[PDB]
Inverse folding.
């Protein structure tokens, strides 16, 4: 069924994770037609500034995620940054996430594939839709069987990303496609020491993604985005999550009739 | 508000081609009564890549052909102008005067269109940012236009390729009604060397995106046999697929509409 | 010999034209190895804002240019915007300039070609280097024999232009190539009601143009750029013109040894 | 100040290939005494497009091969790391630790390199704006690096193409020494499907541009027979053309130098 990956960008505290996890569990009970997957990063390994928030470590993060998985029975997904992290993260993560900048790092991909878990790769901002065919092949080579490719924007001049929706049908030829509604509107390093983004475009582009056709949506949410330690400009208020999910399910129900074959 | 659907053959290859397409557009206007149809066709392709490509049969012949369509089917008309002098005559038959993409910054052309009292639809230049359209609309208001449209037809993305940045729809809606050109948006500028190329397979998906995001109309060129078109042969929709595409976007629009943001 | 097209962006007054023309005449006498061509627009037909400066008309402009041509004996070049202007402008203009946004408008090209004058086309920001082959062909078709193609930047995201120097050798296959050092660094509609630009990059990129190899340089200059009515952000101070010309001639003398064939 | 020339075969195909190229680089270092030569070659291509493409013979073998080059020719050495653990061992032989383009934002990799006391050269990511390199340099200074380099290797321009925005050279010079990668800049990412393509014919002209603008060094991969390279076969310079290219850029640099701006 339709996939909805959601949660706070970073594991700011396992307390925050339980709050968001609670709301996601509720939506999970309300939308049985949807498969929810809780997402959160145990470490922001690519911040622009050395002085920005990274996280509390892999140990504290895997622990907090497991708490969410046991307390709410929600599947989990977090991203790895170096080959060694794959195995420990697989203990809890149902889906292992490969960062966009790292989408061509063979060993990271193979490490993830080896865990036997499902793998979701963020399409690099420097990658062409058709170039993702090779990414999928690496994973298959490594034994991955459940592979996802996530659209999250493409380099368009400086400090800007554009979403070429032509990629959704193109990538669908070799993998399930997920649309990242949060990072697609951010402005890389836009604020100097941080990245920007325009929240006002999140919903409009998400509606476009389902109208075009995708297997799932990725959307980061936080009780108080403004206070978020990371991706503050683009995180969605927890309270708006329900309305957007219902909205995309309705659009999908009608649009699906026209989704092209293969 | 009534949804606008601008459709027709890219170029006025002949008065007969126009009546052929017009007949189908008239049939559809009868079924889709919640839609305002506008018949489009250029009397001249003044910007072909090659000197050897088809241009047209002239302004005189073209306007005559468009008038025939309006009289026989009672359909509104739109066509593009290329130099200021053409505004006046074209305004005699055109309900909406279209301003080519490459020309969206030419002050005199915009002014010439504006003073005719007709509606004006500006194709957003491939070099223009969405927020730069505010001044385009200002120029038109200054020249007297009361009904203004801004059309999204793609932006330069590397060489011989265009990308559609859907953030442009809500941005431009701040100062004008917004039209999405479903056919030129999948065009590959100069892609075939002496001609431009295109990917027909992406027309429908992107048009669904456009209506899900929210726009006031769609512009899509159609032709009985796209393969034989004298222009835009790679992006023109087969006339028989027109009805289905329209039904589909009216359906996606309806279900999405309640979520369109207020500007 | 090496071509140097220079002058004030717009004909703000024939007074301004005579001042700049005087300095250019002096450089002309000092650099006999160079062919100077005085440039100025009788009308800015594509301003972003309706409230910006356009000019004093085609009559007043052609008159002022002729004054420069007679008083200093300098060849002339100005740009046309609609087909009818070609003939009258040819009376004075040795080289007719085709605006970048208008580089694919067949009739404008043919009108210019018909005058028997030389034609210089600004490569559209939306055009690929190889796409200029067709532009040249239109002109030849129209009877033009002295054809130039000017590099002036390419659309790179929003409100930004990038100079792909690969274009210089590519366009050279079918026409003489001129590098526009002034418009290449401007930021389209950058100031909202006007375009921006960074003067600090003009000289560096001009040095690159001659190191790569081009048949000429196009450079706008003004006694007091800050007061210029158009392109204020990118116009070069008249006083710096001599030093830059000498600089490019020296770089060209050494570099020319390595300019690739054809 | 001494001009830096980083050259060598893209990948350590064998210790013999290295000695072959090293021998010529040593001969050239003897002639061009005003130049500081640094021998480059990767012990691993950790980011190939295809799983079936050549990667290398391992870190152990590679470092052993690079050491042989340093001992036999007395040349400085540089090679890239892909994960933090590799910094320490690689630092035993590498004078300059290179950080791959796609990895220019990975904090731990940068930190690992910085704490070795070796010089660090960061390839500017194809997704990074020139002004965004300031934080990259800050991270390195924070981790202990005292000798830092930023390499220009092109920016994403549409699909499967890169463009070099020479404005990056003076911009980046504000916080670090600047190197121009003459070979990867003409590369066509994923251009050949399972491999990347490239246009060798543009290497020389763009390198002339780089030195005319002003930079502190050039990075150019060379190989006895580019056509047979196991990687970057499309952008690697034939070893015999190396000498001429270097002479030419030293000449253009000299004549242009008096015009280089002060930052
Ligand atoms: O530019 P800054 O603010 O460090 O932001 C980096 C974020 O955008 C980052 O961690 C994001 O989730 C990266 O992919
Ligand atoms: O590049 P060619 O095929 O001449 O095409 C130009 C057309 O696509 C053109 O007339 C289009 O309708 C231009 O705006
Ligand atoms: O954006 P504004 O300030 O109107 O500027 C337009 C100038 O850049 C313009 O006339 C220039 O010489 C156009 O090509
Ligand atoms: O796309 P392929 O040919 O695998 O190439 C990747 C190379 O060009 C690569 O290793 C280059 O040296 C990457 O940064």
């Amino acid at each position: 069924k339709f996939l909805v990956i959601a949660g706070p960008n970073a594991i700011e505290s396992e307390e925050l994770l339980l709050k968001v996890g609670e709301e996601i569990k509720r939506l999970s009970e309300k939308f049985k037609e949807v498969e929810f997957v809780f997402k959160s990063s145990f470490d922001k390994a690519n911040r622009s500034s050395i002085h920005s928030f990274r996280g509390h470590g892999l140990e504290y993060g895997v622990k907090a995620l497991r708490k969410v998985k046991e307390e709410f029975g929600l599947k989990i997904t977090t991203d790895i940054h170096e080959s060694w992290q794959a195995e420990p993260v697989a203990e809890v993560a149902d889906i292992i996430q490969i960062p966009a900048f790292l989408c061509r790092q063979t060993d990271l991909l193979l490490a993830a594939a080896k865990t036997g878990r499902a793998v979701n790769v963020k399409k690099g901002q420097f990658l062409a839709p058709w170039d993702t065919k090779n990414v999928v092949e690496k994973l298959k080579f490594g034994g991955a069987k459940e592979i996802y490719l996530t659209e999250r924007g493409t380099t368009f001049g400086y400090n800007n990303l554009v979403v070429d929706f032509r990629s959704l049908p193109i990538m669908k030829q070799w993998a399930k496609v997920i649309y990242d509604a949060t990072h697609s509107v951010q402005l890389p390093g836009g604020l100097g020491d941080k990245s920007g983004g325009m929240r006002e475009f999140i919903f409009p582009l998400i509606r476009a993604a389902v109208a075009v056709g995708c297997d799932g949506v990725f959307m980061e949410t936080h009780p108080e985005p403004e206070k978020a330690l990371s991706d503050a400009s683009t995180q969605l208020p927890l309270s708006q999550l329900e309305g957007i999910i219902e909205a995309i399910l309705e659009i999908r129900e009608v649009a699906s009739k026209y989704y092209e074959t293969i």
Observations:
- Residues C 9, 44, 46-49, 52, 186, 189, 194-195, 230-231 surround arabinose-5-phosphate (ligand 3) (CB under 6 Å).
- The interface with chain C takes residues 155, 157, 163-167, 169-170, 186, 199, 201-202, 204-206, 208-214, 248, 251-252, 254-256, 259, 261 of chain D (CB under 8 Å).
- The first helix of chain D runs from residue 15 to 31.
- The CA atoms of residues 41 and 185 of chain D lie 17 Å apart.
